[PDB]
C-alpha cells in the first residue's frame, strides 16, 4: 500500500507553542525528489501554498523518504488543515513520475 503517512492526524495547541508534522512515503520503491506543503484555514475550502518563511521550517531525509514541517510561535489563524505532497520525478526504481499526498493534519490553536 504505496502512500504518504502524515502524523499526527489531529492536534490541539496553545498560542506560543510549536508543532511538528511528520510525513513518510511508505511501501514505495520510489525516490523522494521534492516536497510541497498546503494549508486550508478553518472553515475554508481553498487549498493554498505555504511559504517556507520565518515561523515555518522544513526538514527532509531523502534516503528515509521522510520530511517534516515545524511551525513555531503558533497563533489562532494557523488553525486549519495542513497537507504534505511528496514528489517522485526520477523514474528508476519508480514505475511513475508525479506526486502522492498525506491524509492531512487538523490543527486547533487556542488562547
Amino acid at each position: 500500500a504505496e502512500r504518504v503517512e502524515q502524523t499526527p492526524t489531529t492536534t490541539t495547541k496553545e498560542t506560543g507553542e510549536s508543532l511538528t508534522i511528520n510525513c513518510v512515503l511508505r511501501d514505495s520503491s520510489c525516490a523522494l525528489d521534492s516536497t510541497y506543503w498546503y494549508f486550508t484555514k478553518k472553515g475554508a475550502t481553498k487549498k493554498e501554498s505555504l511559504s517556507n518563511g520565518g515561523r515555518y521550517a522544513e526538514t527532509v531525509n531523502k534516503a528515509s523518504k521522510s520530511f517534516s514541517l515545524r511551525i513555531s510561535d503558533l497563533r489562532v489563524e494557523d488553525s486549519g488543515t495542513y497537507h504534505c505532497r511528496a514528489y517522485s520525478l526520477s523514474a528508476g526504481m519508480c514505475a511513475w513520475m508525479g506526486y502522492i499526498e498525506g491524509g492531512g493534519t487538523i490543527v486547533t490553536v487556542n488562547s
Binding site: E2, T9, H83, A95, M97, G98, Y99, I100, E101, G103
Partner: protein
C-alpha cells in the same frame, strides 16, 4: 477547432460512477493544458506511468480516454499496474504496460451525507479477474460452490455487489476519493490530442 479539451466535464461532473460501473469518456480533436491539472493542488494523487507529467504539454496522442469513478481512500493504491485486491481484480484493472496518469482527490464534502452516503457500489465476487479496461455491470448471483445457483441467493450463492457507506467523520482511508485515469494511445494515425506547446 484548435480549442480546449473539455476536461471540466470529466473532473467537475456533478455525478461520478460507482467503480464497478466506471465511466469512460473519449477525448479527441482538442488542445489539453495537462500542466494546469498537474499544478492544481486539489489532487492528493497524480502518478504518470511511461510519461513525465512535466512533458505532457509537449506531446500529441492519437486518442486519450478519461476513466472516472469513486472508491475509498485506502483503495487508491489499487489503481496501478500490477496491483491486486477487490478493486483491481473485480472492478477496474490497469494493463501492466499502462501509459497515462492516475489522478485522485478527497471527495468527502461531495460524496458523504450526514447519516452516510450509500449510493456507491463495488463488485465483491467474480469467477475470474477483469482483463485490463474490462467493465462488468452484471448482477448474476455468484456461484461460490459446486451446487448450482438458479438465480437464487443461498449459502454459497451471493449477490455480487456491496455498498460503500461514506460516513463524513471517518478517517481519510474510509473517505470517498474521486479518481480519473487518463490513458494515452500513440498509434500509426493522425495525432488529434496535443498540449499547447506541441506541433
Amino acid at each position: 477547432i484548435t480549442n480546449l479539451c473539455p476536461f471540466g466535464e470529466v473532473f467537475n461532473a456533478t455525478r461520478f460512477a460507482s467503480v464497478y460501473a466506471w465511466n469512460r469518456k473519449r477525448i479527441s480533436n482538442c488542445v489539453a493544458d495537462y500542466s494546469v491539472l498537474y499544478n492544481s493542488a486539489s489532487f492528493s494523487t497524480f502518478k504518470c506511468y511511461g510519461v513525465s507529467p512535466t512533458k505532457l504539454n509537449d506531446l500529441c496522442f492519437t486518442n486519450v480516454y478519461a476513466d472516472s469513478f469513486v472508491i475509498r481512500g485506502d483503495e487508491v493504491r489499487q489503481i496501478a499496474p500490477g496491483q491486486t485486491g477487490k478493486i483491481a481484480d473485480y472492478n477496474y484493472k490497469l494493463p501492466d504496460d499502462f501509459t497515462g496518469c492516475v489522478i485522485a482527490w478527497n471527495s468527502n464534502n461531495l460524496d458523504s451525507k450526514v447519516g452516510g452516503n450509500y449510493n456507491y457500489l463495488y463488485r465483491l465476487f467474480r469467477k475470474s479477474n477483469l482483463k485490463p479496461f474490462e467493465r462488468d455491470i452484471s448482477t448474476e448471483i455468484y456461484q461460490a460452490g459446486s451446487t448450482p445457483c438458479n438465480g437464487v441467493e443461498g449459502f454459497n450463492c451471493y449477490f455480487p455487489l456491496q455498498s460503500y457507506g461514506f460516513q463524513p467523520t471517518n478517517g481519510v482511508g474510509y473517505q470517498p476519493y474521486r479518481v480519473v485515469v487518463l490513458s494515452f494511445e500513440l498509434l500509426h494515425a493522425p495525432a488529434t490530442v496535443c498540449g499547447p506547446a506541441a506541433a
